[PDB]
């Protein structure tokens, strides 16, 4: 229990409703390595995700890339949910297309 | 620019009985190798990943790593018991080298405990980092007794690695040297006001990593531009967001400017409207 995770959600391309895209979630700067990460669609877990290998940076904190192929729309709300020893409850960060 | 070989290892000891060891290799910013513990094999991630090495040569490295992984593991648990170190343990190792065109070759072998540096292989032996608590010094004394391991590590670093990397560079140069032009878009962020605007600039899909993104009024950089972290895409290109917290009236005439090596001097300029 040292460093708590940063969570950043973003897309590969500018969101255009009804067009194919990729939603990325980058979890970084956490320690120790034990972590749980999920991409969310309207609150529900996305099963067809892909992730990268656990890695770390010069300062020894760990990072992880999650991503899934998706199509944005007016209605659908996408998010990234993380759980870690440094958190008292899983943290959720919402994809904001205009941010 | 430079394309160092970074060999990463993540060994997690939860208790005396449960441990997990995984590794990867990065050449420059490209991940070339994967080593899972649910596999007694080192997976190559690019067709040029094996460099100029035979399968005989390569297949031995396969076996030498397994012996390493287990030796390291029991050695750690043993240090833990001697030095009364409490579980769980987070050991990390960052080792490799980088080849210089075309004379010398520098190398490095760093190990961290619980996310903090403790020791490294400097010259023909192990040295503790200056901060290191004193138990690390006892560990150094033990480690430095093993002249066999020393010479081995020194050989890998000063000999094998450089030789290996040179191969990788020859075979993968084309992919390393590639340039990928980014695309940029504008958007309105969460109101810092009212009555304010958060001007957000998106730059995504660029390679390699070094980029330049600033909000501008003509040729005047906006001291106030706040760039975010450079984030990775699944396709080995990056993503960067730059914001400006401004009075709504200021937005008019403001532009977002992207400078990247792939653009060949032709900056991307997006105007706020
Ligand atoms: C060593 O640790 C095992 C649990 O590993 C955990 O993994 C994550 C879940 C996280 O908690 C991490 O920090 C821990 O290290 C202990 O218990 C169990 O191992 C079994 C394997 O089948 C598995 O169900 C779980 O990982 C865990 N079960 C639980 C707690 O529900 C081991 O402790 C015990 O060993 C047995 C002799 C027995 O005491 C039993 O209670 C546990 O298996 C630890 N290893 C040993 C052998 O001491
Ligand atoms: C909790 C505190 C941890 C501090 C310790 C951090 C140590 C970081 C240094 C790691 C270097 C490698 C340590 C593993 C031991 C040897 C590593 C290695 O690269 O060689 C393996 C070799 O040790 C094979 O097994 P062996 O049984 O020990 O011997 C083989 C050599 N002989 C016997 C042929 C001479
Ligand atoms: C040749 C690439 C294989 C790298 C695997 C990770 C090893 C990290 C530990 C280095 C001693
Ligand atoms: C010990 C780092 C270099 C390994 C080359 C295969």
From Swiss-Prot, chain A:
Disulfide bonds join 25-80. GO terms for molecular function: identical protein binding; MHC class II protein complex binding; peptide antigen binding; protein homodimerization activity; structural molecule activity. Glycans are attached at residues 1, 19, 41, 48, 58, 91, 94. Residues 5-93 form the Ig-like C1-type domain. Keywords: Amyloid, Amyloidosis, Disease variant, Disulfide bond, Glycation, Glycoprotein, Immunity, Immunoglobulin domain, MHC I, Pyrrolidone carboxylic acid, Secreted, Signal. The modification Pyrrolidone carboxylic acid is found at residue 2. It is linked to Immunodeficiency 43: A disorder characterized by marked reduction in serum concentrations of immunoglobulins and albumin, and hypoproteinemia due to hypercatabolism. Patients may suffer from recurrent respiratory tract infections and severe skin disease. This is Beta-2-microglobulin. The chain holds residues 21 to 119 of 119 of the full protein.
Swiss-Prot record, chain B:
Residues 1-272 are extracellular. During protein synthesis and maturation, CD1 family members bind endogenous lipids that are replaced by lipid or glycolipid antigens when the proteins are internalized and pass through endosomes, before trafficking back to the cell surface. Residues 162-269 form the Ig-like domain. This is Antigen-presenting glycoprotein CD1d. The gene is CD1D. The lineage of its organism: Eukaryota, Metazoa, Chordata, Craniata, Vertebrata. It is found in: Cell membrane; Basolateral cell membrane; Endosome membrane; Lysosome membrane. GO terms for molecular function: beta-2-microglobulin binding; cell adhesion molecule binding; endogenous lipid antigen binding; exogenous lipid antigen binding; lipid antigen binding; lipopeptide binding. The keyword Transmembrane helix applies. Antigen-presenting protein that binds self and non-self glycolipids and presents them to T-cell receptors on natural killer T-cells. Its main location: membrane. Keywords: Cell membrane, Disulfide bond, Endoplasmic reticulum, Endosome, Glycoprotein, Immunity, Immunoglobulin domain, Innate immunity, Lysosome, Membrane, Signal, Transmembrane, Transmembrane helix. A D-galactosylceramide binds at residues 75, 146-149. Expressed on cortical thymocytes, on certain T-cell leukemias, and in various other tissues. One of its GO terms (cellular component) is extracellular space. It comes from Homo sapiens. It is a single-pass type I membrane protein.
């Amino acid at each position: 229990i040292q460093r708590t995770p940063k969570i950043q959600v973003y897309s590969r391309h500018p969101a255009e409703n009804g067009k194919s895209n990729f939603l990325n979630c980058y979890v970084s700067g956490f320690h120790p390595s034990d972590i749980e990460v999920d991409l969310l669609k309207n609150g529900e877990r996305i099963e067809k995700v892909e992730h990268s290998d656990l890695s770390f940076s010069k300062d020894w904190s760990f990072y992880l890339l999650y991503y899934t192929e998706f199509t944005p729309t007016e209605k659908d709300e996408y998010a990234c949910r993380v759980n870690h020893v440094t958190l008292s409850q899983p943290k959720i960060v919402k994809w904001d297309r205009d941010m | 620019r430079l394309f160092p070989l970074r060999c990463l290892q993540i060994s997690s000891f939860a208790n005396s009985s449960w441990t997990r060891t995984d590794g990867l290799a990065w050449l420059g910013e490209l991940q070339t190798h994967s080593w899972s513990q649910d596999s007694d094999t080192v997976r190559s991630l690019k067709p040029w990943s094996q460099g100029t090495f035979s399968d005989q040569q390569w297949e031995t490295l396969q076996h030498i790593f397994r012996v390493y992984r287990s030796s390291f593991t029991r050695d750690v648990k043993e240090f833990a018991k001697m030095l009364r170190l409490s579980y769980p343990l987070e050991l990390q190792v960052s080792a490799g080298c980088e080849v210089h065109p075309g004379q010398a070759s520098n190398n490095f072998f760093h190990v961290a405990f619980q996310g903090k540096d403790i020791l490294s292989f400097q010259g023909t032996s192990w040295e503790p980092t200056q901060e290191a608590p004193l138990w690390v010094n006892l560990a150094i004394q033990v480690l430095n007794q093993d002249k066999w391991t020393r010479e081995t590590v020194q050989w890998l670093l000063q000999g094998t690695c450089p030789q290996f990397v040179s191969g990788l560079l020859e075979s993968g140069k084309s992919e390393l040297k590639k340039q990928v032009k980014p695309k940029a878009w504008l958007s309105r962020g969460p109101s810092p006001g009212p009555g304010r605007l958060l001007l957000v600039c998106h730059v995504s899909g660029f390679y390699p990593k070094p980029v330049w993104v600033k909000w501008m009024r003509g040729e005047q950089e906006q001291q106030g531009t706040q760039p975010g972290d450079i984030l990775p895409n699944a396709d080995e290109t990056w993503y960067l967001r730059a914001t400006l917290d401004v009075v709504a009236g200021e937005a008019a005439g403001l532009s977002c400017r992207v400078k990247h090596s792939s653009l060949e001097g032709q900056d991307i300029v997006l105007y706020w409207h």
